[PDB]
Amino acid sequence: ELFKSNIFKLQIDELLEQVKLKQKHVLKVEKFLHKLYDILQEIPDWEEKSLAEVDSFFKNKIVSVPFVDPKPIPQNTNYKFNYKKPDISLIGSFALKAGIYQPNGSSIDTLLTMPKELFEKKDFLNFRCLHKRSVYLAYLTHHLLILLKKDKLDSFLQLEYSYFDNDPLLPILRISCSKDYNFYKTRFSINLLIGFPYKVFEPKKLLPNRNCIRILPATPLYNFSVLSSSTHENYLKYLYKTKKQTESFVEATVLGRLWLQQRGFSSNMSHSGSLGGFGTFEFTILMAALLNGGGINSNKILLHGFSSYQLFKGVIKYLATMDLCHDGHLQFHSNPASKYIDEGFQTPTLFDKSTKVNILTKMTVSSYQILKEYAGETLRMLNNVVQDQFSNIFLTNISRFDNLKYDLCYDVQLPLGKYNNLETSLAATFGSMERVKFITLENFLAHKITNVARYALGDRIKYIQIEMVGQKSDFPITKRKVYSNTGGNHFNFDFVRVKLIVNPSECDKLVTKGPAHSETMSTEAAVFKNFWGIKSSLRRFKDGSITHCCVWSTSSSEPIISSIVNFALQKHVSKKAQISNETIKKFHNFLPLPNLPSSAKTSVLNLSSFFNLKKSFDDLYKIIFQMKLPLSVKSILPVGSAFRYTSLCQPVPFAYSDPDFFQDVILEFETSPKWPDEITSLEKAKTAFLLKIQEELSANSSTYRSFFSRDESIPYNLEIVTLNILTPEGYGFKFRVLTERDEILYLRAIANARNELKPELEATFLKFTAKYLASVRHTRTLENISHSYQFYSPVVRLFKRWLDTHLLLGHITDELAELIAIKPFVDPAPYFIPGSLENGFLKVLKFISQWNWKDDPLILDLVKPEERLTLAQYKGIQMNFTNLRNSDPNGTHLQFFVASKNDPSGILYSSGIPLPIATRLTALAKVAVNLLQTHGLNQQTINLLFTPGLKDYDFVVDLRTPIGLKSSCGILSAPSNFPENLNDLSEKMDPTYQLVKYLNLKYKNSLILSSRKYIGVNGGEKGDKNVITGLIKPLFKGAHKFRVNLDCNVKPVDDENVILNKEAIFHEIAAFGNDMVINFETD
Amino acid sequence: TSDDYVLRIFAIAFTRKQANQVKRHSYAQSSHIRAIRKVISEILTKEVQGSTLAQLTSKLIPEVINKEIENATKDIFPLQNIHVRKVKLLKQPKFDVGALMALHGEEKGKKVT
Amino acid sequence: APESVADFERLLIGNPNSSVVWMNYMAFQLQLSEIEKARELAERALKTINFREEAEK
Amino acid sequence: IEDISAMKNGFIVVPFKLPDHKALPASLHFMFAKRHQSSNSNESDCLFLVNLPLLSNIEHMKKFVGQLCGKYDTVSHVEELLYNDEFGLHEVDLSALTSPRNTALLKFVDAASINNCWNALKKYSNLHAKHPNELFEWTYTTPSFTTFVNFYKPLDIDYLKEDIHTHMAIFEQREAQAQEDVQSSIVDEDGFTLVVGKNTKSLNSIRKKIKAKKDFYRFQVRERKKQEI
């Protein structure tokens, strides 16, 4: 605990001093608030007045009384209104002495308390006290205006009406400044509060279950608003007492506020499509309660003696482990220990016995659940001993984009109209009972929409939130409330967006199972059928279950979630609603689709293609073992991209124009001591087994087809031979042989070679091991991890497609691409594990954009959720990275560094990458994230970030293949056999990638080149267009003394110095691609 | 294994005799016994730590681990009847219905009314 | 005439076995008084330069 | 660029115009040559050639030497060309490891041919210096679909069979000779025998293959006494 404790504590103090406040601004606002007290005592009072009296008053006055809805009426205002000198108090992080330097700007509350002799026992009913407060604050604001016009500070002061954390029942006063009391630079604000004294109305009469609006259902929000306004100060005093009792209270408070701010939470009312309610005030309350007790045994789980880190541990673990909503709640006394009860009131219940208040009535159940999920996430990442998570916890703001925070988004336009128009517009009704249960229609619709979506999906999501686009909390002084008219409404929004944390394993299910069946139709089945209406049906299954249920239609373009939410809202909410997410629609459109039967209906998590592929391979695999040879076959291990769920376009029978058509399989024999000991003789022995196997297969399995492709992808081995086999399932594999003598011979060549030759031979051995040895472990772990992480396959597919569109794949290797794409899943922090294609792809792009490979290495924990990298292994990898970067302090020889249990060296898949390529990749990631930030997410942005730039390209060669390869590749906009001539197979095959490979071999000393690997997806409609982009190295672009190994094509400027020969190089390229070259464009 | 399946493997072997034996018995010394036990242990553990459980059964079917054991111990002492006697599961990981369905290589009803 | 580390790295990326470029970088580092850094960059040049350029070695 | 006819280090520039391509709005592919100075018998009568065009093979060399002989009335018979590794695939020979780039060599039949073509290329350099049109246009054996599907050619089983059979036969011959050589009781010229353990195969392999007390005496125990006291 000591090591992490010290590092975490030094980080604590570092961050707090970094974010520390400004005492000059403190004293500035302190003298300003003293002047405010003086102005308050200068304000005169107002006697008992009627509705007509106050109406005339504020009618002749410019200020209008912001009456709560519904407004008071003469027919029922038999009582009256009064204003006296209010008691004055200070509240806030400043009041607790734990303020910070907020860049956005903060505010400190000051409370005005209305007089008891102005009160009556019959005032907490039917908005009597609410209208009292409304007129009280209206008078206060008018006289503040007149005293401001007296003191002549109106030049830079700004006064506006507001709501107490967006509470319409609690309108407050907002004060800000602009450019001697010019506190504008302090970036602070002031909040005038109007409250009630302590024990003004009976708390048990004002309990949430109680009703205090006659017309019977409880009035919980009414109760909480009034009783909080009543007992505001007792919490302040209790918090101060606890702060003085303990030592690190302010430190824990600032940690909490920073963490919640980064998450995107506050004390803002959450009940109306907003994410908040839990903020610093109630956080402090909670810390006080837990140091007061907390256990079910009411024991002191929080001792006053801990440090800030310990207090944060206790609070966050209590939040992650202890339920406050459904099956438990906590109860305490502010004047008596804190005891936990296993009773949950179906809402977060922190209940103070001393004041009979539940503090947490600002909670939606969804908000409580999602906060508990954050709590658990932070527990695991704070118990993580190996990696440090301080940055991931505190130095990141997740609430910057909804599409990154959450998986699915759906925008809905709601042209509801007006209060009367709701009845003909809303399917549901909003009468008196509905008004009293949700005072504000925004609240009513928010609860209704959350309940309908939650019931409509259930298992299909893990978490849900709703946001009304267009919500406001401020309005001018001359208004009774906030007024808006756009969006086909008269309310404080434009439209709505539902947002979804989805369960991937449950997302795709074709049938929304319901309850069972009897002759008597039980309550749950009854409500289910009534809810689903026409969709509901009774259906039977093979086990013989009779259950009401609903079926859907899978699509390759949109989720079953899309269809379900669309129907549910169009039926049970409104008939005029409009629902969409064209972003995800277009993403699924861009993910390639194969030429297979029913591909349009095929879901994205459908691996049926991979599985048919695996099955045919299994057939061939049994054939090879039962074949007989001079040596027994030890094992056959597939290493195919298809086998590891990473091919760009899913394999299709007879689609041999795919580059990934020939998956590779290592074929490892038993250990004979009679191998050749010379390298090429050994390779020829391998070819000898392959030829024997081919003969036997040709004789006894005449249905298969075979030939020999001479591979030399491994440097300085001119004798690699791969047996290509075509299986009548229309698939194709290539076999190569492995041997411990291969390993030993490569090492012996390393040893024997000269030291100036050593690095090249090391690189060759490295390529060997990457292809032959580690690839197997990589594909094993990759498959297993994928099945645990479903969406990984589609996200990495689309990412790899994007890289081909930008022409990086000719240089970045598939293993490296897959490692990067699997990073977000295996390292979800601080987000969730991605649950949609969109969310995953954007998380990948955000990571790659923010990655600083010059300093940050990459260590991946390829494990299932909860063989993990132990501390020693992590230390060793960090040591490897440090030594490597110390040797190469600029990254010239190596840019990226990705390590795993499979790769302790962190080199295998990252070597041989040009620095121009690496920096271009980083630049593209940066430009994509900036474009998303600025233009806002839309399908036009999608097209922009998927189309290539064709910029910073010294030369561009546009070529086109004579035949269309899209159909033969098997991607929809089809072959069904193999050509009788494997030579004709080669004919149909695409050359351009190997062309650019050879050319890069020729000019890598001088030129860097890129192409499109996958034509059928980026070759236009016909799938036949390709482009070669070429850049020239700087000094060869310049000039050098012409010495014997010039390694370039040049034009001599002098009789000893030369300059490079651009147009001759272009001519060489053109002749090389003579048949295919169509257009050339120079710089 | 790599699948997080804690496993226990028992192997046996019997010291056979050469083609020109004349000695009635073919007994090995305790040294040869210990050497062969070490070799068998390292072979088994290397194989089933590089493997996965499905891959483990695929290896264990056509008697290939014991072919390896023979081919490795062929220089200490000539053996016979080398077999992987028994395999025992001990711990299982978190369940995985997707892994099972893939390993085996969705449906509607019939409108009862 | 490279003057920054970025320019030196660009010259080396253009030509890694460039003995003139490595020598210029070493002279610049020695001028900036980084003996250990110059030695490490010389080691990098040894590790990167071609086995064909014996004269450069 | 016109007066630049030869190099002060001796090299002579040999340019080459190129055809006006469709996508291009002539060239001069510059190339250099110098006589070779090698003690090797097979590397004599050789011209060292620099900045060759792609796939500069014997046919291209014959065409160019024919152009030179026809123009300058010289006689020069090429015999064979060396070091034609233009992609970088034969720099290290792993075979003999475990048992001059962007340039080539061109051997001729005699010094008569080599000096005739040397004078011819000198006159070609003069052509570049003065009249750049009387030069020669370089023609590639075109890299196109036919030769690259040839590059994707499925390999001939008969060729592979014969190659493997021959290669194994000679390999086994060499291996067995090494076996007898290393295990045939090697005795030095003077009386010395060499020890080779069983199952070794190569002399090359062999070449590559290549308690006290503290408290016993007087000085000991007396010093222990002295340091302890």
A1067 Cβ under 8 Å from any chain D Cβ: yes
Contacts of D27 in chain A (CB under 8 A): 1063-1064, 1067
Q: Is the Cβ of A527 closer than 8 Å to some Cβ of chain D?
A: no
Tokens matching residue C45: 């040049």
Map residue D226 onto helix, strand or coil.
helix
**Experimental approach:** cryo-EM
Helical (H) or strand (E) element with A685? helix A679-700
Q: Report the residue of A536, A632, A643 to disrupt the B interface, i.e. the one with the largest count of B CBs within 10 Å.
A: A632
DSSP-H helix ranges across A888-1038: 915-935, 939-946, 966-969, 982-988, 992-1003, 1015-1018, 1034-1037
Q: Tell me if chain D has a CB within 8 Å of the CB of A988.
A: no
Give the chain B residue whose CA is nearest to the CA of A540: B109
Cis-peptide into A70, omega within 30 deg: yes
Of the residues C15, C21, C39, C46, the best mutation for testing chain A's interface (the one with the most A CB atoms within 10 Å of its CB) is C15
Collapsing DSSP states into helix, strand and coil, what is residue A174? strand
| Beta carbons of B109 and A549 less than 8 Å apart | yes
CB contact under 8 A, B68 and A671: yes
A551 touches chain B (CB under 8 A): yes
Q: Which stretches within A806-870 are classed as H helix?
A: 814-826, 837-850
Q: Domain-by-domain residue ranges, chain A?
A: 1-20+196-205+246-401, 21-195+229-245, 402-510+554-580, 581-950, 951-1083
Written in H, E and C, the secondary structure of A71-118 is CCCCCCCCCCEEECCCEEEEECCCCCCCCCCCCCCEEEEEEEECCCCC
Burial class (CB within 10 angstroms; exposed 0-12, middle 13-18, buried 19+) of A16: middle
Domains, chain D, with CATH or none: 1-109 (no CATH), 110-169 (6.10.250.2760)
Q: Which of A887, A1034, A1036 sits opposite C10 (nearest CB)?
A: A1034
Beta-carbon contacts of residue A761 (< 8 Å; ≥ 6 apart): A749, A750, A753, D92
Residue A642 per-residue DSSP state: G
The CA distance from A919 to A853, in Å, is 10
CA distances (Å), A322 to each of A226, A318, A373, A916, in order? Answer: 28, 6, 12, 52
Give just the sign of the alpha carbon dihedral A516, A520, A523, A528. positive
One-character DSSP codes across A223-279: HHHHHHHHHHHHHHHHHHHHHHHSSSHHHHHHHHHHHHHHHT--SS--TTT-S-S--
Closest residue by Cα to residue C53 from A752, A1005, D47, A1031: A1005
CB atoms within 10 A of CB A537: 16
Query: Apex CA D173: angle with CA A719 and CA B75, to 5°?
Result: 85
Cross-chain Cβ contact D91/A1067 below 8 Å: no
β-pair type (B80-89, B7-14):
antiparallel
Report the candidate in A116, A193, A147 with the shortest Cα–Cα distance to residue A43.
Answer: A147
Question: Fold identical between A1-20+196-205+246-401 and A402-510+554-580?
Answer: no
Which residues of chain C are within 8 Å of residue D101 when distances are taken between CB atoms?
A: 52
Q: Are A487 and A477 in contact (CB under 8 A)?
A: no
Mention every residue, 6+ apart, whose C-beta is less than 8 A from residue A60: none
Choose the CATH number for A1-20+196-205+246-401 among 3.90.700.10, 1.10.630.10, 1.10.1410.10, 3.40.220.10: 1.10.1410.10
Q: What is the dihedral of CA A180, A184, A188, A190, to 10 degrees?
A: 60
Contact assessment for residue A278 and residue A363, using Cβ atoms and an 8 Å cutoff: yes
Q: What distances in angstroms separate CA A444 from CA A418, A447, A532, one per listed residue?
A: 15, 5, 22
User: What are D87-90's contacts with CB under 8 Å, separation 24+?
Assistant: D87/A998, D87/A1001, D87/A1002, D88/A1001, D88/A1002, D89/A712, D89/A715, D89/A716, D89/A718, D89/A1001
How distant is the Cα of A693 from the closest Cα of chain D, in angstroms? 13
Q: Which residues of D16-27 are buried (b: 16+ CB within 10 A; e: fewer)?
A: bbbeebeebeeb
Q: How is residue D128 written in tokens?
A: 């570049």
The residues facing A540 across adjacent strands are A546
Picking from B2, B111, B112, the nearest residue to A781 by CB comes out as: B2
Instruction: Report how far residue A270's alpha carbon sits from residue A360's, in angstroms, rounded to the nearest whole number.
Output: 10
Residue A1005 and residue A1035 in contact, taking contact as beta carbons nearer than 8 Å: no
A951-1083 placed in CATH 3.30.70.3030: yes
Q: Which of A510, A546, A867 sits opposite B112 (nearest CB)?
A: A546
For A1009, phi then psi, to 5°, come to -130, 155
D213 touches chain C (CB under 8 A): no
| C47 reaches D (C-beta below 8 A) | no
| A1034 CA: distance to closest CA in chain C (Å) | 5
For residue A892, give the nearest of C9, C40, C51 by CB distance. C9
Indicate contact of C with B: 3+ CB pairs under 8 A.
no
C48 and A759: CB-CB below 8 Å?
yes
User: Is the Cβ pair D23, A1046 closer than 8 Å?
Assistant: no
Task: List Cβ neighbours of A726 (8 Å cut-off, separation of 6 or more).
Answer: A656, A704, A705, A706, A732, A978
Which residues, 6 or more positions from D193, have their beta carbon under 8 angstroms from its beta carbon? D185, D186, D187
In this structure, which amino acid lies at residue A743? E
Joined tokens for residue A468: 């009304």
Chain-centre distance of CA D33, in angstroms? Answer: 17
Longest dimension (CA), chain A: 113
* Beta-bridge partners for A163: A171
CA gap A337, A291 in Å, rounded: 9
Distance from CA of D48 to the nearest CA of C (A): 17
Can you name the residues that pair with A409 across neighbouring β-strands? A499
Q: What is the dihedral of CA B98, B100, B105, B106, to 10 degrees?
A: -50
**Are A756 and C9 within 8 A, CB to CB?**
no
Listed residue (A878, A920, A644) closest to A780, CA to CA: A644
Q: Does A725 touch chain D (CB under 8 A)?
A: no
Contacts of D167 in chain A (CB under 8 A): 680-681, 684
Torsion sign over Cα D91, D95, D96, D97: positive
Three-state DSSP class for residue A648: coil
Tokens coding A150 = 């007296």
User: Does residue A720 sit at the D interface (CB-CB below 8 Å)?
Assistant: no
Interface test with A, best of C3, C9, C11, C13 (most A CBs within 10 A): C13
Chains that touch C (3 or more CB pairs under 8 A): A, D
- The Cβ of residue A563 has, within 10 Å, a number of other Cβ atoms equal to 14
A539 and B59: CB-CB below 8 Å? no
Kindly give the pairing relationship between strand A898-899 and strand A87-91: unpaired
Find the residue in C nearest to D101 (Cα).
Answer: C52
Helix, coil or strand: residue A851: coil
The helix/strand/coil state of D20 is: coil
Tokens of A263: 């998450």
Query: Which residues does chain A have within 8 Å of residue D28's beta carbon, measured at their own beta carbons?
Result: 1051, 1064
Q: Which of A540, A615, A634 sits opposite B109 (nearest CB)?
A: A540
What tokens appear for B76 in the block? 């200490």
Cis peptide before A676 (omega within 30 of 0): no
Chain B residues with CB inside 8 Å of A551's CB? 108
What is the rounded CA–CA span in Å between residue C8 and residue C18? 11
CATH of domain A402-510+554-580: 3.30.70.3020
Resolution in Å equals: 3.8
Cα–Cα distance for residue pair A163/A474, rounded to 1 Å:
7
